Design a protein around this ligand. Structure first.
Ligand SMILES: [Zn+2]
Ligand SMILES: [Zn+2]
Ligand SMILES: [Zn+2]
Lengths: 258, 258
């Protein structure tokens, strides 16, 4: 049986190639997770089909219906066999799906236009002249919603009732908002993404301060999957071979344009 | 039944309290892992007994005899029920015991005596006046032994044949060797340990260069253990609640001497 891989279009993890119109199947995509999927498939010895998650979300549970959406949902409901993407390993998700050991370590970070008078999370929480927000349906937003840390909770009370919404639907929208806000909007996002964008022209953003937390991205499989065990060992093997470090260089700095 | 916890005497993870002779049981020890053990036990709801691994090793399989030593061996042979220590998550170990998601992220790093003209692994590899080695019997030594990367293999070729041995029995031994080397010996060890020592008197060592790799420490249990699932969720919950960050600040910087 061909393994159905659910993923998400998020640069530089998964992106359509420039000449995709003349390509088919998995050949239409390129990126860190596309190379990773190939590596895993080869090691676990299976054929696969990359599919972009329907609703374009990572995964959250509807408070009222208790229904899971995003990639997590595709696994939970059996629409996908494995998820290979920048999916954060979290307690609530671990309760419903399986995660391999992390293939990438990261943390929440701050993205500023450039020249913006902000160097830390505290700086943001001290003023209101500069707005800030996060992605939606993600682990970053939830981080602030649940944080008991004085500063982070103070940052959440603002973001929650912020008018208009400081939250964005996709990373691209957040980065776009930062760039066109004359430095009046700071974006909170996962460090790996921050670092990638900082190397992308117009080269007008920069990551500031240390990460607010420490987390990891993991490959996910549904509970009781015959793939989980093998995939977990594959990730460890790949990290130990240095392949994972090889891949980040390739997609983050070898292609940097700043 | 009371859970038997195996751990190792490695500062600041586990250390005998100054007046341990006056105390009994678990109260005899203090440290990052002692604090972590208490929390994991509370959240998982079990009583435990801390025990220092008999042979003072982390865990390796002897080729030929096929016997596992160290903390890994105690889990494999059923002498301990869980290992709470700076035990590196590795593929070979993952094949015989279970690991929770990492509670700490780190990488191999370089420790020099302040003033040593070394800034990278490449630097070490391209010279010979300054000797260098690693802890013996651990994941750091194995990283070099198994590495297929040019720089690191070149480093391993030197270390494995150096005489007298550049390997050390304990971290304290490696650090003391660096301190009395007059800059003629550099020590390769895990980043978190390097960072800790850099904050201890006489304040004569320093971490240089970026980490050579990326990995993490995890709580280990025997395969098929009844505690596995709960311990894993506890680690994720404790990280998400910020405890892990609080603990590292407590044992690394709050008590810094430099
Ligand atoms: Zn490979
Ligand atoms: Zn709803
Ligand atoms: Zn607690």
């Amino acid at each position: 049986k061909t393994v159905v891989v659910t993923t998400i279009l998020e640069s530089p993890y998964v992106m359509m190639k420039k000449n995709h119109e003349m390509l088919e199947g998995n050949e239409r995509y390129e990126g860190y997770c596309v190379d990773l999927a190939a590596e895993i498939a080869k090691h676990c010895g299976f054929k696969y089909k990359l599919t972009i998650v329907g609703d374009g979300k990572y995964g959250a549970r509807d408070a009222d219906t208790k229904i899971w959406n995003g990639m997590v949902g595709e696994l939970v409901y059996g629409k996908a066999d494995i998820a290979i993407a920048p999916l954060t390993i979290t307690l609530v998700r671990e309760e419903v799906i399986d995660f391999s050991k992390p293939f990438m370590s990261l943390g929440i970070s701050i993205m500023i236009k450039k020249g913006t008078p902000i160097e830390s999370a505290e700086d943001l929480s001290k003023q209101t002249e500069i707005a800030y927000g996060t992605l939606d349906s993600g682990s970053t937003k939830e981080f602030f919603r649940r944080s008991k840390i004085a500063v982070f909770d103070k940052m959440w009370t603002y973001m929650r009732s912020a008018e208009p919404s400081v939250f964005v639907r996709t990373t691209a929208e957040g980065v776009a908002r930062v760039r066109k806000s004359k430095g009046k909007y700071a974006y909170l996002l996962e460090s790996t993404m921050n670092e990638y964008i900082e190397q992308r022209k117009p080269c007008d953003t920069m990551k500031v301060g240390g990460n607010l937390d420490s987390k990891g991205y993991g490959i996910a499989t549904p509970k009781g999957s015959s793939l989980g065990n093998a995939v977990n060992l594959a990730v460890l093997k790949l990290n130990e071979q240095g392949l994972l470090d090889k891949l980040k260089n390739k997609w983050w700095y070898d292609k940097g344009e700043c």
